[PDB]
Amino acid sequence: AQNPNCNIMIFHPTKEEFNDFDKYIAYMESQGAHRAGLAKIIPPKEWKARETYDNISEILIATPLQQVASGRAGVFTQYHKKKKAMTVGEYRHLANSKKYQTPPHQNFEDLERKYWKNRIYNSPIYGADISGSLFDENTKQWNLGHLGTIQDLLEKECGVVIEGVNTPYLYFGMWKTTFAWHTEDMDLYSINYLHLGEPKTWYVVPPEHGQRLERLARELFPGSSRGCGAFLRHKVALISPTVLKENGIPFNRITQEAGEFMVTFPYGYHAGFNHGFNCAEAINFATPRWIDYGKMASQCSCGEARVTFSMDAFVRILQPERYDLWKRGQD
Numbered sequence: 001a002q003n004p005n006c007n008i009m010i011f012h013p014t015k016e017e018f019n020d021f022d023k024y025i026a027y028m029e030s031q032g033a034h035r036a037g038l039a040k041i042i043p044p045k046e047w048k049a050r051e052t053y054d055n056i057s058e059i060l061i062a063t064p065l066q067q068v069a070s071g072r073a074g075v076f077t078q079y080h081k082k083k084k085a086m087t088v089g090e091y092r093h094l095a096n097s098k099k100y101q102t103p104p105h106q107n108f109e110d111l112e113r114k115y116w117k118n119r120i121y122n123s124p125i126y127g128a129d130i131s132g133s134l135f136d137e138n139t140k141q142w143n144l145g146h147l148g149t150i151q152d153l154l155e156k157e158c159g160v161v162i163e164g165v166n167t168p169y170l171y172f173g174m175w176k177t178t179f180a181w182h183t184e185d186m187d188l189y190s191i192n193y194l195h196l197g198e199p200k201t202w203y204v205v206p207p208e209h210g211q212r213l214e215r216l217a218r219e220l221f222p223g224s225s226r227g228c229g230a231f232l233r234h235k236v237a238l239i240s241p242t243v244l245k246e247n248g249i250p251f252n253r254i255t256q257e258a259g260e261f262m263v264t265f266p267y268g269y270h271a272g273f274n275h276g277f278n279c280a281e282a283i284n285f286a287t288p289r290w291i292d293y294g295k296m297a298s299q300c301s302c303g304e305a306r307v308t309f310s311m312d313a314f315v316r317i318l319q320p321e322r323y324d325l326w327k328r329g330q331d
């Protein structure tokens with residue numbers, strides 16, 4: 001078996017290899033990339049997402065989210081407090097202000113140390129889940145607004161035609177903005193392009209070991225676990241690399257820089273944080289290998305994990321026994 005230690009792999013496709021998206025994902029998996037839960041893809045030097053980022057300041061962040069932490073430095077939850085709308089230009093200025101800016105640091109590892117030491121004592125503001133794309137319509141390769149849809153994949157594989165759409169989301173981040181431990185909706189793949197700005201550090205658990213992370217989470221967040229059998233779907237729980245190591249949970253880490261893609265694989269738990277002002281674009285996608293993960297995905301029915309209506313068809317077709325209970329939670 002390829003990549004038996006489940007290391008995060010880094011790929012450098014040629015411009016010829018960058019033409020056929022599906023084919024390259026399949027190639028990465030032939031080399032064992034999926035066993036890590038996360039891969040980095042560095043685009044060919046000839047490629048670009050768009051010409052410049054000089055004219056993005058008028059994009060609106062309708063509902064910026066203030067991420068307020070509770071708990072201890074290495075084990076905490078965060079809740080999202082809604083703030084007043086602001087443009088990306090206003091948000092960038094806020095990110096760079098003395099209150100929110102990245103501190104002096106020696107390197108990525110120094111900044112990582114500072115993040116886990118001090119994150120809970122601040123409440124950074126995030127622009128998340130903003131429907132849109134910053135890819136030029138003329139960018140033909142790895143354009144996250146032009147990918148084959150998950151609905152068409154399900155139809156090609158299983159012959160069922162379903163409603164729903166599949167479009168990208170923008171994320172504007174600042175120092176200490178945080179994404180909690182989670183897998184994707186329906187344990188789908190995701191792909192994330194860092195368009196502009198400071199890095200994003202990722203943590204990931206191999207899919208074959210996801211249940212180990214779930215068991216630790218139940219132990220560390222006991223009230224949440226009693227409330228919901230799939231509470232990581234709520235996307236509010238953080239556990240530090242130090243605490244993961246103390247509990248023998250297998251994981252890896254890597255830092256994504258501007259101009260790089262990351263792919264997360266079905267049932268690969270991931271979490272992370274932003275180093276400073278940045279902008280990323282991400283979308284879910286599927287392959288034939290995903291279908292069995294979609295069938296087995298654990299669902300939240302307690303009401304906290306409200307999601308887009310396009311997930312309805314996924315649960316309805318792949319998980320008909322679970323559908324009634326899940327749908328009640330979406331109401």
Ligand SMILES: O=C(O)CNC(=O)C(=O)O
Nearest residue numbers: 171179190191192280282
């Ligand atoms: O970048 C973020 O804030 C979160 N992104 C993801 O979880 C992803 O791309 O799957």
Ligand SMILES: c1ccc2[nH]cnc2c1
Nearest residue numbers: 165166185284308310311
């Ligand atoms: C299913 C379909 C589209 C989606 N967009 C975000 N999550 C999704 C799940």
Ligand code: NI
Nearest residue numbers: 183184190264
């Ligand atoms: Ni994700």
Ligand SMILES: [Zn+2]
Nearest residue numbers: 228300302304
């Ligand atoms: Zn729940």
